[PDB]
Design a protein around this ligand. Structure first.
Ligand SMILES: *[C@@H]1O[C@H](CO)[C@@H](O[C@@H]2O[C@H](CO)[C@@H](O[C@H]3O[C@H](CO)[C@@H](O)[C@H](O)[C@@H]3O)[C@H](O)[C@H]2NC(C)=O)[C@H](O)[C@H]1NC(C)=O
Ligand SMILES: *[C@@H]1O[C@H](CO)[C@@H](O[C@@H]2O[C@H](CO)[C@@H](O[C@H]3O[C@H](CO)[C@@H](O)[C@H](O)[C@@H]3O)[C@H](O)[C@H]2NC(C)=O)[C@H](O)[C@H]1NC(C)=O
Ligand SMILES: *[C@@H]1O[C@H](CO)[C@@H](O[C@@H]2O[C@H](CO)[C@@H](O[C@H]3O[C@H](CO)[C@@H](O)[C@H](O)[C@@H]3O)[C@H](O)[C@H]2NC(C)=O)[C@H](O)[C@H]1NC(C)=O
Ligand SMILES: *[C@@H]1O[C@H](CO)[C@@H](O[C@@H]2O[C@H](CO)[C@@H](O)[C@H](O)[C@H]2NC(C)=O)[C@H](O)[C@H]1NC(C)=O
Ligand SMILES: *[C@@H]1O[C@H](CO)[C@@H](O[C@@H]2O[C@H](CO)[C@@H](O)[C@H](O)[C@H]2NC(C)=O)[C@H](O)[C@H]1NC(C)=O
Ligand SMILES: *[C@@H]1O[C@H](CO)[C@@H](O[C@@H]2O[C@H](CO)[C@@H](O)[C@H](O)[C@H]2NC(C)=O)[C@H](O)[C@H]1NC(C)=O
Ligand SMILES: CC(=O)N[C@H]1[C@H]([C@H](O)[C@H](O)CO)O[C@@](O)(C(=O)O)C[C@@H]1O
Ligand SMILES: CC(=O)N[C@H]1[C@H]([C@H](O)[C@H](O)CO)O[C@@](O)(C(=O)O)C[C@@H]1O
Ligand SMILES: CC(=O)N[C@H]1[C@H]([C@H](O)[C@H](O)CO)O[C@@](O)(C(=O)O)C[C@@H]1O
Ligand SMILES: *[C@@H]1O[C@H](CO)[C@@H](O)[C@H](O)[C@H]1NC(C)=O
Ligand SMILES: *[C@@H]1O[C@H](CO)[C@@H](O)[C@H](O)[C@H]1NC(C)=O
Ligand SMILES: *[C@@H]1O[C@H](CO)[C@@H](O)[C@H](O)[C@H]1NC(C)=O
Ligand SMILES: *[C@@H]1O[C@H](CO)[C@@H](O)[C@H](O)[C@H]1NC(C)=O
Ligand SMILES: *[C@@H]1O[C@H](CO)[C@@H](O)[C@H](O)[C@H]1NC(C)=O
Ligand SMILES: *[C@@H]1O[C@H](CO)[C@@H](O)[C@H](O)[C@H]1NC(C)=O
Ligand SMILES: *[C@@H]1O[C@H](CO)[C@@H](O)[C@H](O)[C@H]1NC(C)=O
Ligand SMILES: *[C@@H]1O[C@H](CO)[C@@H](O)[C@H](O)[C@H]1NC(C)=O
Ligand SMILES: *[C@@H]1O[C@H](CO)[C@@H](O)[C@H](O)[C@H]1NC(C)=O
Ligand SMILES: *[C@@H]1O[C@H](CO)[C@@H](O)[C@H](O)[C@H]1NC(C)=O
Ligand SMILES: *[C@@H]1O[C@H](CO)[C@@H](O)[C@H](O)[C@H]1NC(C)=O
Ligand SMILES: *[C@@H]1O[C@H](CO)[C@@H](O)[C@H](O)[C@H]1NC(C)=O
Ligand SMILES: *[C@@H]1O[C@H](CO)[C@@H](O)[C@H](O)[C@H]1NC(C)=O
Ligand SMILES: *[C@@H]1O[C@H](CO)[C@@H](O)[C@H](O)[C@H]1NC(C)=O
Ligand SMILES: *[C@@H]1O[C@H](CO)[C@@H](O)[C@H](O)[C@H]1NC(C)=O
Ligand SMILES: *[C@H]1O[C@H](CO)[C@@H](O)[C@H](O)[C@H]1NC(C)=O
Ligand SMILES: *[C@H]1O[C@H](CO)[C@@H](O)[C@H](O)[C@H]1NC(C)=O
Ligand SMILES: *[C@H]1O[C@H](CO)[C@@H](O)[C@H](O)[C@H]1NC(C)=O
Lengths: 490, 490, 490
């Protein structure tokens, strides 16, 4: 009696969460949020990127014009999606440096094709095959022109096509490798010889090679596919005596943000910025462990499957006389993070301190604002999965990606530890600041009891306590009473 | 009266600057410095690196010996500068893997060439062309030897050149692809056949291919360029029946720090360690946003166009009775960063505290010393801009560089935030330390007024105040007076 | 007299060590530990990885079956070690893209070979050479079959081998380039023609090229080596009229963690997880400066040759009346890190504080636990040293590795500075916490003397001092005595 107690404290919750800081591998805090995205819907959203589902067609099949890919003519995409079920159903072919032609067409993002009138005087055009049926008739790749002899003559071709446009032209062409010498004569009326396709700045010479390969869709022959880009002011020149699978025109070649992805995920009617082979994923979080292959505004790939960011202070159980924050949280404090408990003539009371609570909350919201909803866009990259063994180039592609992921995984680990340490520090600091400013108000009218509470040595009723909480307490009013109570022989 | 006031404080400035810390996206400090270099002079300084301006010549034109490049013979460089205006003016040629030959010669850093006496018995040497004029006469690449028939015979060449030196030899040679069968016979007196250039450890076979290409400087033929490196103790062997553009000797191949850069920046008479395509840039700062392409001791390329490093404390306006540092800076404090203000019998005074001021300044200068003027040198790297579409290899080169820049940009962002937080912390700490040590000196002779000031409960004249500032105040001298004043019923 | 002194302090050592923090380039602490591994034993331990020492054989020589490599047949490895002394001693050969075949076999980790019965009707099998002696007889590569004419006929080969297995088959084969037209006829009875090796998904055509190369072990001819991987359900088809160096079967191709390393280090009977070309190195430390080439659970390569992690507090000399921690350490404090010194009626004493000491030690041990003995495994990577000049691909391989090392070296530098700052902070904090809690116990019975000591204003014998140290001091017992002593006119 003749005194009061005023304790400073902070909240605690019954269901806290464990995070990592620089000081502690495990510390329980009142709340945290997940920074690694680990699930996908399992579908690729068809918005807001332009998606082209290849269905049974690879990009290269759609480029050459396999009959089952006729519906793709002239289409564009942000992301071309190639399915594992895709298969070729025309004349058997290969592309030396297939991966590069696939990449450059994918990045260009368009199959726009402009027909041109090549002068094929002296040969038969439009060769077809039972291996490439279009609406039940023998046919061929839509964008290619199989030239054969005319009246058992195949005169030497020396054919030109100038580029008088303001843009580049991509030409796709081929060399036919017949199964037998019989086929060579039947088709071209003479022995095979080289093909040379040239411009002012480039030349490619290819040798047709007669011979049986293992039959594919019953065909032992092959076509090998080549490409040439022709600049404005340059000229395509084609020089051949046979075996030429000629271009019917050129593809536009564009630059932009298009790419290609291998995925079996279904395409859905929905909207998501970040695409992975597993499906679209939300991009609120800064990191993700779903797939290293991404397109769009995506979280960065890391190895961790969880990284928890503290969003509240240390969670400290309440010890079973009122008491302050020293080794003690207040589970009953539910309208603030920090506050006051008092005992005086009028009872025992609690009040939240708004300023300290808001100071902590604002700083935590600040770091969430830097980390949440801030992903950056990436588009065409490098391949990261491989179906064939290749050696040196693939070794480098894999090492580049491994290197990158380990460096990001490190950054993520350090960032979360540093941020969590800072959160513990800033929330501890708001408690300490509140205690110190209360101490300063009280001057010589109170003593520190060592448990986060002051013994106030004068009668201090509810309004008096309120004056301390509100920062309007006038210590001079009570000093005489308090000094007498403090410094009395007992 | 019978008392004095002593306030602890810190300076403030009218023109502060905004920086970023871990706690605050924006906090005003008294001063900061820029860590991202964003401008260039626009010229490449000719010192201290040895610069070779290619003018109208590419490195490869200078290597082969295009007549307009004769002035480059045998020159060395640290940095070869290739101009966008550069053009070839000799026989039209291509180099399979041009980029690699360009790179290896660039990195070697020398065009030193040693003539050798090949045994070309039975052929005519020194073929020339109107397409390659030297001083108005028909000529040819200086370092190459166009062999043609002698008396309508071209006997099979089987020619040797041993390397009996202690160093490697770089041989440059070529294959002529004539426009027509008429030219083939006119030049070599027989049908074309393969060329084989070999050593004990390597072999290259190349097939001349007759045919018209689009005319370049009125020439429908082409030369294709190849290279062979011959080790000490090995032997070059050249085997041909025509179409051989022979070497006249070898290039020295060196190892060191040389490179090549594409730039149109003028070369100036000045001295700068760091070269970019935009010109030389100062290298005081740790980061730069001028160009990802660099040579020499250069700041690291980042995406940010500014990163401000705090070089002073938080800048806090002065509130409109003297008062201390609590929510309050002192704009009138101009000879120190921290200090004392007092009110006593003799007036109101101010003095700077040297120790605390110097402690902060020394620590800030320390971090400037780690960050300023400490760039590291890089020399030949990878190419980072491309004039042609290529696919896989280029995709990887671009991804490697993008990856690197994003990781450095992250490091830069975190470093500056961490350093700035530390600067705010260390400057706040010097203020708090000064307050605490003053508190300790005063013992029971003063009370904390809560605004960064002490109420000293005894007469404390100028010399008394000085004794506190100087750390020589003897509290026992005044304790009796002070205790009487403090603990008095009023 | 009628008073006592109680000082709070921390230990100091005569032999401290210099570390780097964020605040200080150099600060002496009581102890530190090295985080960069800089030495090796100089031997490669034969455990726990399966080591295969190539001795005089390269992997490719062991693959083809050079007689000196017969002992390697069918062996497996985790790490194949190639020696600089290794040399070929059979028919001279080259491998276009040698580096890739070396890499893919190295990564597969097995030389397991299954013989198959090819139908070589109409030719002579098992050609041998004096250039490839096996037990003093003319012989040839064990895994290859040199086919020559039979009765001066070499009928066109068109030979099949289906893959009816559940795994992939690696075929190694070759093309013989004879020195002269005489050898061509002597061996194959007709002019040279192309070789085509194909599957349903691939084709390779190679042209034998007759001509003398510089003699190697007295042989001017060459064999060029090729490879083909055949999938389950696919078929190998070989088509040739001569010059075929045929496969005798296939290699198993596996996937796993195998690699290859160039080293001259001796192999020892010992156990070490981390292998470098310099020898095995311990992997307790997180970083190493021994070699960028590593295999196994290894520290990460950095440029620094030392990084010292503080494992104790700031080391502060003792100043030459007892005194506390303010600018002063206690070299005589050897059974604790923090403690108490007192002066009372019964003498001058010292005692360690266990709690504070253990708190610091536990946190330091925690960070050691994150950093020590926690390396991660890497296996087959990219090559990092090169014996030949190559240009573009090598430039990229080198730049990737340089980039990686600089980023890790940065991470290491920042990590150690941050950790050391945290250690200084946490150890400083334990001292400050101990002082503050002692202050709180003492209430109004003591004053802070400003040197880390309290003047206790009552008789405080050994048991009284112990009660303070033990946290059981009851300030109310002594308050009357203390207040009288404190507030007395003198
Ligand atoms: C070189 O050898 C090849 C493999 O032995 C061979 O290919 C095979 O040819 C046979 C016979 O033409 C094909 O068998 C087909 O036989 C009947 C004929 O009416 C067809 O109706 C069937 O569809 C049946 O498949 C094989 O399919 C074929 N095998 C492979 C792997 O392609 C070549 O013919 C040989 N080349 C030469 C020039 O002789
Ligand atoms: C294959 O076709 C080529 C393109 O049509 C052709 O090249 C062209 O040849 C003509 C005629 O020689 C050149 O025209 C030149 O005509 C007069 C002749 O006196 C010259 O004075 C002029 O300079 C004029 O240019 C073209 O310049 C040339 N076109 C190109 C694109 O190179 C080849 O000649 C043909 N090849 C064969 C073997 O017939
Ligand atoms: C093309 O030129 C080559 C280099 O001059 C040449 O190779 C050289 O051939 C000679 C003679 O055969 C070899 O000399 C050998 O002479 C005696 C003959 O009994 C041997 O016992 C010795 O071992 C001695 O070496 C050279 O070794 C050889 N030089 C090289 C560098 O390989 C070719 O023969 C020529 N090719 C043609 C088709 O003529
Ligand atoms: C490229 O075109 C030229 C010109 O048409 C071809 O040259 C003719 O080839 C025929 C058939 O081999 C010869 O009989 C003529 O004598 C050639 N004409 C001229 C004007 O030289 C040439 O063969 C073609 N080249 C290729 C590789 O197909
Ligand atoms: C490499 O040089 C050898 C030796 O000079 C050439 O071989 C001669 O070639 C001529 C012309 O074709 C033949 O008539 C001779 O019979 C060959 N001589 C010998 C000793 O074999 C060979 O042709 C050259 N090779 C190449 C690819 O040019
Ligand atoms: C691949 O094998 C086929 C079939 O055996 C070869 O074709 C024969 O080649 C001979 C010799 O040149 C000719 O006389 C026959 O007329 C061909 N037979 C048939 C059925 O066409 C062919 O030459 C081989 N190809 C290669 C590149 O070696
Ligand atoms: C362009 C052309 O001639 N196409 C014809 C081919 C080829 O002559 C041979 O297949 C070449 O080997 O033969 C067919 O029987 C076929 O297989 O469909 C009919 C087709 O019209
Ligand atoms: C080495 C040689 O023979 N050079 C001569 C060439 C070539 O014979 C043809 O250009 C080959 O196509 O012809 C010229 O008229 C020329 O164009 O300058 C004269 C020159 O001396
Ligand atoms: C497969 C074969 O025929 N091997 C024979 C070779 C070759 O005929 C020529 O070396 C080819 O140039 O010649 C030998 O004298 C030799 O050099 O060892 C004997 C050997 O049995
Ligand atoms: C925990 O923190 C997150 C992020 O600020 C917030 O959205 C959520 O409401 C909080 N949860 C609780 C139970 O307070
Ligand atoms: C793709 O091919 C499969 C298998 O032939 C067929 O059943 C399916 O209808 C095809 N899909 C499309 C879209 O053409
Ligand atoms: C096609 O090329 C031939 C060359 O043999 C030429 O003579 C003819 O005029 C060209 N045809 C047309 C329609 O221009
Ligand atoms: C995504 O697909 C990859 C590759 O197939 C797989 O490893 C991973 O488990 C998948 N992740 C999720 C969340 O579906
Ligand atoms: C605000 O201050 C006044 C001072 O008279 C005090 O009585 C009142 O209770 C305070 N309000 C609160 C909500 O604490
Ligand atoms: C601000 O800081 C920089 C770096 O220390 C210093 O060079 C400059 O003089 C300072 N400017 C002012 C106005 O104090
Ligand atoms: C480069 O070529 C241009 C265009 O022909 C010419 O005007 C200029 O003088 C040349 N410069 C040099 C240095 O030869
Ligand atoms: C040049 O080579 C021929 C080979 O046909 C040789 O006979 C002659 O001696 C050589 N000439 C000289 C000058 O050594
Ligand atoms: C430097 O040149 C690059 C590439 O042309 C350009 O993007 C950039 O704006 C330039 N920077 C400056 C400061 O001139
Ligand atoms: C230094 O200390 C003495 C103590 O007598 C004091 O009087 C003097 O004013 C002090 N000097 C300064 C510059 O404060
Ligand atoms: C120093 O620290 C290391 C790592 O904790 C420890 O192993 C060693 O015993 C310590 N050395 C001394 C002299 O205390
Ligand atoms: C390797 O070759 C050298 C040199 O001929 C020989 O002395 C040594 O015994 C060989 N070693 C083995 C293991 O065969
Ligand atoms: C080998 O191939 C020939 C083709 O000429 C074939 O006729 C023969 O039956 C085959 N031999 C065996 C043993 O199967
Ligand atoms: C390891 O070997 C490398 C490469 O030869 C050498 O540079 C380095 O000094 C070696 N390090 C040690 C500790 O032996
Ligand atoms: C523990 O506390 C008791 C309190 O009576 C004290 O007397 C004793 O000396 C303390 N023990 C130590 C080791 O300080
Ligand atoms: C094929 O070419 C012929 C010329 O022989 C042309 O009339 C026809 O329209 C072409 N068919 C196409 C492009 O589908
Ligand atoms: C060209 O070669 C001839 C030999 O026919 C020689 O005499 C002359 O000096 C050479 N000219 C050069 C290298 O400029
Ligand atoms: C070589 O082939 C013959 C068939 O001519 C066979 O009998 C013999 O066993 C073979 N020798 C080997 C595989 O060592």
């Amino acid at each position: 009696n003749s005194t009061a107690t005023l304790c400073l404290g902070h909240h605690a919750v019954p269901n806290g969460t464990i995070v990592k800081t620089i000081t502690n591998d495990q510390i329980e805090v009142t709340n945290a949020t997940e920074l690694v995205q680990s699930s996908s819907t399992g579908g690729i959203c068809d918005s807001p990127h332009q998606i082209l589902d290849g269905e049974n067609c690879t990009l290269i099949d759609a480029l050459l014009g396999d009959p089952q890919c006729d519906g793709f003519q002239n289409k564009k995409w942000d992301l071309f999606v190639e399915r594992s079920k895709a298969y070729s159903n025309c004349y058997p072919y290969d592309v030396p440096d297939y991966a590069s032609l696939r990449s450059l067409v994918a990045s260009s993002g368009t199959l726009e094709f402009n027909n041109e009138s090549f002068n094929w005087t002296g040969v038969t055009q439009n060769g077809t095959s039972s291996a490439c049926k279009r609406k039940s008739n023998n046919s061929f790749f839509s964008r290619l022109n199989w030239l054969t002899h005319l009246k058992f003559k195949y005169p030497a071709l020396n054919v030109t096509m100038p580029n008088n446009e303001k843009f580049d032209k991509l030409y796709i062409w081929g060399v036919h490798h017949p199964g037998t010498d019989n086929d060579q004569i039947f088709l071209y009326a003479q022995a095979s010889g080289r093909i040379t396709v040239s411009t002012k700045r480039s030349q490619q010479t290819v040798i047709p090679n007669i011979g049986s390969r293992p039959r594919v869709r019953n065909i032992p022959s092959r076509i090998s596919i080549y490409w040439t880009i022709v600049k404005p002011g340059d000229i395509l020149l084609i020089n051949s005596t046979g075996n030429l699978i000629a271009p019917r025109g050129y593809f536009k070649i564009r630059s932009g943000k298009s790419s290609i992805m291998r995925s079996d995920a279904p395409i859905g009617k929905c909207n998501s910025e970040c695409i992975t082979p597993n499906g679209s994923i939300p991009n609120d979080k800064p990191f993700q462990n779903v797939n290293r292959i991404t397109y769009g505004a995506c979280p960065r790939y890391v190895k961790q499957n969880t990284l928890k960011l503290a969003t509240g202070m240390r969670n400290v159980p309440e010890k079973q006389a009122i008491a302050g924050f020293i080794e003690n949280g207040w589970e009953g404090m539910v309208d603030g993070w920090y506050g006051f408990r008092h005992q005086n003539s009028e009872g025992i009371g609690q009040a939240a301190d708004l300023k300290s609570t808001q100071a902590a909350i604002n700083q935590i919201n600040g770091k969430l604002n830097r980390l949440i909803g801030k992903t950056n866009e990436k588009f065409h990259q490098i391949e990261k999965e491989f179906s064939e063994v290749e050696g040196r180039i693939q070794d480098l592609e894999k090492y580049v990606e491994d290197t990158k992921i380990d460096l990001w995984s490190y950054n993520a680990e350090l960032l979360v530890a540093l941020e969590n340490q800072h959160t513990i520090d800033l929330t501890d600091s708001e408690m300490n600041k509140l205690f110190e400013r209360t101490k300063k108000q009280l001057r010589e009218n109170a003593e520190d009891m060592g448990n986060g509470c002051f013994k106030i040595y004068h009668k201090c009723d509810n309004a008096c306590i309120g004056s301390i909480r509100n920062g309007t307490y006038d210590h001079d009013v009570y000093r005489d009473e308090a000094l007498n109570n403090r410094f009395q022989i007992k």
